[PDB]
Design a protein around this ligand. Structure first.
Ligand SMILES: NC(=O)C1=CN([C@@H]2O[C@H](COP(=O)(O)OP(=O)(O)OC[C@H]3O[C@@H](n4cnc5c(N)ncnc54)[C@H](OP(=O)(O)O)[C@@H]3O)[C@@H](O)[C@H]2O)C=CC1
Ligand SMILES: NC(=O)C1=CN([C@@H]2O[C@H](COP(=O)(O)OP(=O)(O)OC[C@H]3O[C@@H](n4cnc5c(N)ncnc54)[C@H](OP(=O)(O)O)[C@@H]3O)[C@@H](O)[C@H]2O)C=CC1
Ligand SMILES: NC(=O)C1=CN([C@@H]2O[C@H](COP(=O)(O)OP(=O)(O)OC[C@H]3O[C@@H](n4cnc5c(N)ncnc54)[C@H](OP(=O)(O)O)[C@@H]3O)[C@@H](O)[C@H]2O)C=CC1
Ligand SMILES: NC(=O)C1=CN([C@@H]2O[C@H](COP(=O)(O)OP(=O)(O)OC[C@H]3O[C@@H](n4cnc5c(N)ncnc54)[C@H](OP(=O)(O)O)[C@@H]3O)[C@@H](O)[C@H]2O)C=CC1
Ligand SMILES: CN(Cc1cnc2nc(N)nc(N)c2n1)c1ccc(C(=O)N[C@@H](CCC(=O)O)C(=O)O)cc1
Ligand SMILES: CN(Cc1cnc2nc(N)nc(N)c2n1)c1ccc(C(=O)N[C@@H](CCC(=O)O)C(=O)O)cc1
Ligand SMILES: CN(Cc1cnc2nc(N)nc(N)c2n1)c1ccc(C(=O)N[C@@H](CCC(=O)O)C(=O)O)cc1
Ligand SMILES: CN(Cc1cnc2nc(N)nc(N)c2n1)c1ccc(C(=O)N[C@@H](CCC(=O)O)C(=O)O)cc1
Lengths: 267, 258, 258, 267
């Protein structure tokens, strides 16, 4: 049987490595994107060239805002999330794995309309959208006759090993990852009767090159105890792939740091 | 005369905190949403004990616009009310909180959206804006006239790490509130504003034998004072080196397993 | 008149805790190992303030036999000393602790063995036996005459989760002490004995700019009182619902990263 | 190249599944035992029959006590630990992985000579021995010319997902696993310059059958959220095997619970 994975924010960086890793194990993957349409579609062609009808793309703004319909009233985040899960059942009749990877990240310093949009985008992508996606995912397994349910349902939330040692100026982001840790434990307990495992993976510093200038990149990366560098995308994605595997079937409600020991440091 | 702003101060733990802060000598702003009678009464009682020592401000802390006025603005006005009235705000206790189920399994969408805005707003988004407004006011006060003992206390939950079945949005919001405690504690340290949490286990359940009987210490839920006295302590000059920490007040219930 | 047993009470934080407990009215047993002069002096000062309010007992708390006498026996005698003298022991503060490096990399074996016995004994094995002896005495006292406020405070470390390079045995012993706090808090709940921890960050470093300057709140280490006042609070009847918990007193240093 | 793993307490149950799992990946394994000599030696024959010269056995009491020499003065735990690591270099010239699995577990209620032996056995097996074994392991890699060091050194400590919700009456055991968590973080930081990763795996309830009578076994196992049963030995060992793999190379200083969500419960 060919299981299916829905990966949010899958066009590049960590999300693309998670989609590639799952595809390498045999999963058909639904690649969600927000602004990186070209990149998502290129990845999709690359995957379908390797194995036909093994990848599809779907667009969505996961911020906690209402959007205009694509054909009466404004569409809610809840609906958009339900439609992402639906795309998987419509195309392949199942959704075995959900990886909540999409996430906005920018400052919200404590010391007008921008603040409201930042709250909805940072909390929606990192926490409210994952909540609605898990709810739609669980509803679809619950509506599937037991004799037709898959045998290895897994949800992975991408959290952050370092949020307990806050990055100064990123309060809303930090709060939203703490809510995501709370969703991981609450959903793991609640969904355990359906055999749906829910776990987190929390990178420390990963693929810094694209986000920081040389000198800043060098300076951050030097404080990681193990290897004195940021991780590669595969160093993170291989752990997500292992948690979705049948070998990790007794693991639920846990968050695994993939941080090279950065959380063990002190100023 | 120091000033304390207590959210959800009309009754139960919020009332107990206001009383305790009032006994150490603070002037207290009693925020309420639906409990106007109870709020006004408490205020009258406190003013009877010591004139012009209590006021009341109403506000919905759900993350919704009202007749428009955003949540932020409402939060800022609550902080502005302490200044306007008494010219200062030294303590802030984020206690108001909605709490009911949001089951993952089994007009409905609109109610779901109201529930996320109410549970997330009261437990996390409002506390954030309140913290941001409190900070902005301390920063704007010339160093020479600042208070010497600014403390912000967030009421968390000792048991959210062992989730209550069917309360996901609430649990997620308390997790966001723990994050806010650590982040604001770090960022507001230069202004000497301490930010800490207090996490009750089972408290004032009546205001049940199945639940109470599982608490290791005393086999009962706590009284309101058993929690507010901890909150007053954290606000005292003696807990001056304590910041970014959450103190459980749960009789050992978090030490238990099924 | 309640009685407190403070280990490593001769100076620094231990001295500050004894002073603070003495000011709330407790009779205090001042344990010491090598600091006889300082211990005896403190005792004289306290007895000058209030007659027959302080004593001194010497004991090595390393996990070694002495001239044989085991550590357990020595621990039991320390508890027996409070009873013998004043007929009661209501509070126990496990503060004594050895702290020096045990590097993983780069007669030697005998010194390694002395180091494990001293660091593990003082920070964890002694506290265990002391707790076991304290419990045994409360259990043996007819319910009718027990105290009404038994508290055991273990001095932990807010920063052991971000280890100091080269102090493995010490870090492991503080981890064992956190375990003891939770286990004894759960097991001693029926006898109403509370067991909690207090974890300093950087305190009384002189009794350094590199270290101090990294503390978010105040950019300095704490004073002794900034830590002992927390310990006295936990021992007070007002923190009666608090059990099995560790309170950090670190100025936010545990919130930092390299 | 054939890497070597030293597994303590490897004769049965979880330890034997960890040794079997590592051997299946190609490692030569040194099987340490204390009282289960016959069982250790049988496993050793089974492994060597599958692949010659791939398994050896070594005996040792890991309690923090001195023992009589096997040929002047009484031998210390430190020496016995160093000799376990030495056995691997003597036989195969290397020791790539160390799994600290051996552990005593029995009550030490708070409410004569037995207490001293319990303290040394419970703290030695669960914490002091792991400390000395890691120290000997690190010393041997440090003494190996860099050009000859292996490329994937990993130490795994078996901890306990449930020690933060203490089992009534097991104080010394609980304290010793807390010290083992402290050793995991301290050693991960200190050894990171040598690229030696140190992580923990913490089962919840596993292979209960042998340790509990039917009715008690049934009652405990029913409180696990996921599956309402205790785990199998492989459900735990597959996670240890994954953490020793090159795919887990950016993970250090972390403890992964394998508990079916049991730590998420409350009384
Ligand atoms: N990189 C690192 O060091 C760290 C990573 N993590 C976590 O790992 C995960 C992956 O990290 P990384 O690859 O760096 O993440 P990115 O910052 O690269 O974001 C991944 C994607 O999320 C999407 N996204 C952002 N906002 C929205 C939105 N409003 N609606 C829908 N999608 C949105 C984007 O899609 P598009 O481009 O299509 O718009 C983007 O490509 C994240 O959850 C992150 O928080 C945690 C700690 C560190
Ligand atoms: N009680 C317990 O066992 C526990 C409590 N806690 C925490 O302690 C704190 C106090 O607990 P408790 O006293 O039980 O709290 P309540 O359930 O009694 O609520 C306190 C108050 O908050 C207010 N509130 C609710 N929704 C809103 C809203 N949308 N806008 C503004 N105000 C709102 C109410 O005001 P009004 O009545 O005026 O409308 C209410 O009186 C809470 O943060 C709670 O999560 C943690 C764990 C356990
Ligand atoms: N100071 C700090 O920054 C921090 C302290 N803490 C903790 O707070 C507590 C108090 O700290 P601090 O005041 O610095 O402690 P110290 O380093 O000053 O030691 C306190 C005392 O413990 C005693 N002691 C040491 N070894 C033994 C032994 N083998 N047997 C009996 N007694 C012994 C000593 O007694 P004598 O002098 O009479 O021999 C000594 O005065 C400790 O548990 C410590 O780990 C935690 C983090 C930081
Ligand atoms: N089973 C479970 O539910 C749980 C397991 N864990 C942990 O997982 C690991 C494996 O668990 P499990 O298989 O149940 O363990 P066992 O209790 O079966 O013990 C494993 C082995 O440890 C050895 N051992 C005990 N004392 C000593 C000693 N003094 N010196 C040397 N070796 C000694 C034994 O060797 P021999 O037989 O050769 O004497 C024994 O076979 C342990 O660290 C345990 O604490 C944690 C939580 C739950
Ligand atoms: C660790 N990290 C990498 C990084 C890149 N993309 C991500 N994307 C998401 N969704 N989540 C992350 N955690 C994330 N992290 C970082 C960390 C700090 C700064 C940095 O400090 N940047 C600010 C400035 C710092 C400040 O506000 O003081 C900037 O915008 O330049 C950048 C990237
Ligand atoms: C601790 N608590 C009291 C209580 C009362 N008011 C509060 N108010 C707020 N704001 N926050 C709280 N945590 C809170 N807690 C509890 C604890 C357990 C259950 C109980 O087990 N309840 C469920 C079961 C859930 C379900 O199956 O729907 C329920 O329906 O409430 C209720 C209240
Ligand atoms: C917080 N502290 C003060 C201090 C003083 N006495 C104590 N006494 C006890 N019992 N426990 C403590 N934690 C303690 N702490 C510190 C903190 C850092 C360093 C410091 O960085 N030191 C190293 C570096 C280690 C090395 O490379 O060997 C050292 O040699 O002590 C020293 C003392
Ligand atoms: C979860 N577990 C399985 C089990 C079996 N072997 C192990 N072996 C080790 N080394 N470590 C473990 N954690 C471990 N755990 C348990 C848990 C409780 C009891 C049980 O309660 N046993 C006591 C009695 C309980 C009590 O003392 O009150 C007994 O000896 O019968 C037994 C096994």
């Amino acid at each position: 049987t060919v299981p299916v994975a829905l990966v949010t924010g899958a066009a590049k960086r960590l999300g693309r490595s998670i989609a590639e890793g799952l595809h390498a194990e045999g999963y058909a993957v639904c690649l969600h994107y927000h602004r990186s349409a070209a990149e998502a579609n290129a990845l999709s062609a690359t995957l379908n060239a390797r194995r036909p009808n093994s990848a599809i793309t779907v667009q969505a703004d996961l911020s906690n805002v209402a959007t205009a319909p694509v054909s009466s009233a404004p569409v809610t985040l809840f609906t958009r999330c339900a439609e992402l899960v639906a795309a998987c059942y419509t195309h392949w009749g199942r959704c075995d794995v959900l990886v909540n990877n999409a996430s906005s990240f920018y400052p919200t310093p404590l010391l007008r309309e921008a603040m409201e949009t930042a709250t909805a985008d940072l909390f929606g992508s990192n926490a409210i959208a994952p909540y609605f996606l898990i709810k739609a995912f669980a509803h679809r397994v619950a509506g599937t006759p037991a004799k037709h349910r898959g045998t290895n349902y897994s949800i992975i939330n991408m959290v952050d090993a370092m949020t307990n040692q806050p990055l100064l100026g990123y309060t809303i982001y930090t709060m939203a990852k703490g809510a995501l840790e709370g969703l991981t434990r609450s959903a793991a307990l609640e969904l355990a009767p359906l055999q749906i495992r829910v776990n987190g993976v929390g990178p420390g510093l990963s693929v810094l090159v694209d986000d920081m200038p040389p000198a800043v990149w060098e300076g951050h990366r030097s404080k990681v105890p193990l290897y004195q560098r940021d991780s590669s995308a595969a160093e993170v994605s291989d752990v997500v792939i292992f948690l979705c595997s049948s070998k990790a079937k007794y693991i639920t409600g846990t968050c695994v740091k993939v941080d090279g020991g950065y959380s063990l440091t002190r100023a």
